[PDB]
Each structure stands twice: as C-alpha cells, then as structure tokens.
Design a protein around this ligand. Structure first.
Ligand code: LNR
Length: 330
C-alpha cells in the first residue's frame, strides 16, 4: 500500500503545516500537524475542556462506529517549546492520503495548553518519531507509521515541505519526480527516539564550507533551524544590524536586509537554504525588526533541523530495520 497527502502552511510565515487525516467511521477529517519530533497522535475532541477549544475541529468518538475506548490508558506530553496536552485513548481507523490503519491509538485531549487553544488551524498532532517516545501509559502505543509499515510497499515516508506553498507527505514510496539530482542517505541514531543524524558542516552565503560534525534531529514539528551558537553567530554576522535580543528571544535583523543563504552538509552533498526562507517577518505588527529563522540551540540541549531546513529539501525517512535519512535538492 501507499498514501499521499498534501500538507499546507497554516499561515503566511510557514509557522507549521497541516495535513488532513480521516479518523473513524464515518470519517471525521481533522487537520493535523505531522511531527517527526514526537510520537503521539492526539486530537482535539468532544472530551476537551470547553474553554480550551477555540475554532478547532474536534474528534467525537461516540459518533464513530469503529471507535473503542482503550481501557485504562492515559497520555500526557510536554513539548520542547513548553506546550502540553493530556487525556485518554481510543483505538479507531485512521487514514492519511488513502493509506488506512485499523486499530490506531487516537489520543483524545482532555486538556491542552494555551498555545494549542490559541491556534485554531491545528486540530492535533500526528507523531512520526520512533514509538519508544510514545507517552501512552500503562501500555505504550505505536505511531501511525509503525502500524502502517508492514503493509507499505517500502518502509518509508517522505516530507516535501513547501516554501510559502503546499507540499506533500508520501507513505510507502519515493516519488522520483519530486526532487532533482540524487538522494544522499545518512546514518540515524534512534537512541533518543528521534530521527537523529550528523550533518557534515555548513556555509554562510557564498562563503567557504566549514567541515564540522553537527548532530541534530530532523523535526517537521519545529518551525526554525536551531544550531550551535558558534554557527548561528557566524551566520548573523553577515547581516548588517543583526543582533541577539534577550527581550525578543533570539536573533533579530533589520527588515530592510537581504539575507544570505545557509548551506548544510549531508555527507558529501549540500542543501542550500535560500535567504528568504530565513525571514520570519516583523517581531510585532508594523515593526522594522524582523525575526530570524536560524537560532541558537544553546539551552535546548539538541540541534534541530526544523522546517526552515527541511523545506529546502526532499527528505526520506527510511524506517527499515536500520533506519536512515535521505536528502535531495528540489
Ligand atoms: N513537538 C511539538 C511541536 O513542536 C508543536 C506543534 C504545535 C504547537 O502549537 C506547539 O506549541 C508545538
């Protein structure tokens, strides 16, 4: 089997991407944030505290003939950005882009934190990291991908995120028309439950490539590119007037600037992030200070190749017995 679904930016900055997902019978379509940095499929629901729902589409398990309470199971998750959600669990039929999994754990939110409530465009998350991170207790549950894997033509999914445009998540096949040149594969460590890999270095603009190992995670659920402070300082030093602002919470730059590109290494290959991808616009409406798309990972504890990096590439998440990651230009 295979599946193919379009993913669409939630706003003009590409802050996140939503992908329609069919849950239950008859189908209830919710727009979920596919997150390769976590491993829970959770949704706004008829069980979510009413004051914490503001515009989201909800899953109502009582209206699904295939929903079954997973008795005694609860979940609770806290994300890197400080947001959180928790609740109980149903199993139900879940389909993405024509690919159907029966008996998928659908985690129904009883509580969500304010950042989820305040974002009316995201109806929940669909985790695509390794199932070892799944938070369901006392019986840990599998991700949608892990459940689908055996049925897939090939044990892979691909992320093809657009810059200010829709893109695609494919399951079970590699669309050889979706990228240019060849795909370069690189080793993955699953020790922390992430798609963790080591970049071979970077360049700023037309500058020389610096060969240096940068361990980080491929994370579709993180907006920005978070890298060591040395790397990030080298980038922003090439933008007149750029500075790190403790009050704003990262590097800002004059909105009048033209940003240089940023290149990262994948083995001997190179992925170029155009400067425009690094512009996250005014820090507040009407401001002439703009927020940068490359930020320091110091304090996070891990480097994160988030959407800023990933949308410059066609990315293969290879879930074979020994997982690997592939990157191609596009
Ligand atoms: N891993 C969680 C992911 O980074 C995320 C998605 C949507 C959010 O509103 C959020 O705060 C965090």
């Amino acid at each position: 089997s295979t599946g193919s679904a379009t993913t669409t930016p939630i706003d003009s900055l590409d802050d996140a991407y939503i992908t329609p997902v069919q849950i239950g019978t008859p189908a209830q379509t919710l727009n979920l944030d596919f997150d390769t940095g976590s491993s829970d499929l959770w949704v706004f629901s008829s069980e979510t505290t009413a004051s914490e729902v503001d515009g989201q589409t909800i899953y109502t398990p009582s209206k699904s003939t295939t929903a079954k309470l997973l008795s005694g199971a609860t979940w609770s998750i806290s994300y890197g950005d400080g947001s959180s959600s928790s609740g109980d669990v149903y199993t139900d039929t879940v389909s993405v882009g024509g690919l159907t999994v029966t008996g998928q754990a659908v985690e129904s939110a009883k509580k969500v934190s304010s950042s989820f409530t305040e974002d009316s465009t995201i109806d929940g998350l669909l985790g695509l990291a390794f199932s070892t991170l799944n938070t369901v207790s006392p019986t840990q549950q599998k991700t949608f991908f892990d459940n689908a894997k055996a049925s897939l033509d090939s044990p892979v999914f691909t992320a093809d995120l657009g810059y200010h445009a829709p893109g695609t998540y494919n399951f079970g096949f590699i669309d050889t028309t979706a990228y240019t040149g060849s795909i370069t594969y690189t080793a993955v460590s699953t020790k922390q439950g992430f798609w963790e890999w080591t970049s071979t270095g970077y360049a700023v603009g037309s500058g020389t490539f610096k060969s240096t190992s940068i361990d980080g995670i491929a994370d579709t659920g993180t907006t920005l590119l978070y890298l060591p402070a040395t790397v990030v300082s080298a980038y922003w030093a090439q933008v007149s007037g750029a500075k790190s602002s403790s009050s704003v919470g990262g590097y800002v730059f004059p909105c009048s600037a033209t940003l240089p590109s940023f290149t990262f290494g994948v083995g001997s290959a190179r992925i170029v992030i155009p400067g425009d991808y690094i512009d996250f616009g005014p820090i507040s409406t009407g401001s002439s200070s703009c927020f940068g798309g490359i930020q320091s990972s110091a304090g996070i504890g891990i480097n994160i190749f988030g959407d800023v990096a990933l949308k410059a590439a066609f990315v293969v998440f290879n879930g074979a017995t020994t997982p690997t990651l592939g990157f191609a230009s596009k």
